[PDB]
Write a protein that binds this ligand. Structure first.
Ligand SMILES: [K+]
Ligand SMILES: [K+]
Ligand SMILES: [K+]
Ligand SMILES: [Mg+2]
Ligand SMILES: [Mg+2]
Length: 136
RNA sequence: ACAU
DNA sequence: CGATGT
């Protein structure tokens, strides 16, 4: 199994979990940063990994790109497949923003179509995903 | 266990 | 060491 280098790699970064969440997408081949989300003051790792995939899908669809997306998140890959983000994060005023974005990502999934393959980045074999934040 |  | 998830 080899890396499909013609792909978009996404990843979350956090300060705390739950904590400040951000995410970015990069060209798997070159590392060029293609998008970066403004930090969200409270979310979970898995909410951010989910938002990152969905943003990638929208980014690639807007550009008429058939590239696959790599994610290292088993959880978020499944949530996108299911079109349902099964987060445990409490809903209150401080988590309102992340839940709004998660709700809206689900809604996008339920109103749009895509053929984009969503692939597991095999960290054990390949090292850190190219979108990783270098914080671990 | 596995993946973050 | 702790947290998020299947
Ligand atoms: K990191
Ligand atoms: K990882
Ligand atoms: K666990
Ligand atoms: Mg990740
Ligand atoms: Mg990472």
């Amino acid at each position: 199994e080899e890396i499909i280098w013609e792909s978009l790699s996404v990843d979350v970064g956090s300060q705390g979990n739950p904590g400040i969440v951000e995410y970015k997408g990069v060209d798997t081949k070159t590392g060029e940063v293609l998008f970066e989300r403004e930090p969200i003051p409270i979310g979970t790792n898995n909410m951010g990994e989910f938002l990152a995939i969905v943003h990638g899908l929208r980014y690639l669809k807007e550009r008429n790109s058939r590239k696959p997306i790599y994610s290292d998140s088993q959880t978020a890959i499944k949530w996108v497949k299911d079109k349902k983000a099964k987060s445990t994060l409490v809903r209150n005023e401080e988590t309102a923003l992340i839940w709004k974005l998660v709700d809206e990502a689900e809604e996008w999934l339920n109103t749009h179509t895509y053929e984009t393959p969503i692939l597991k980045w095999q960290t054990d074999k390949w090292g850190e995903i190219k979108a990783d934040y270098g914080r671990k």
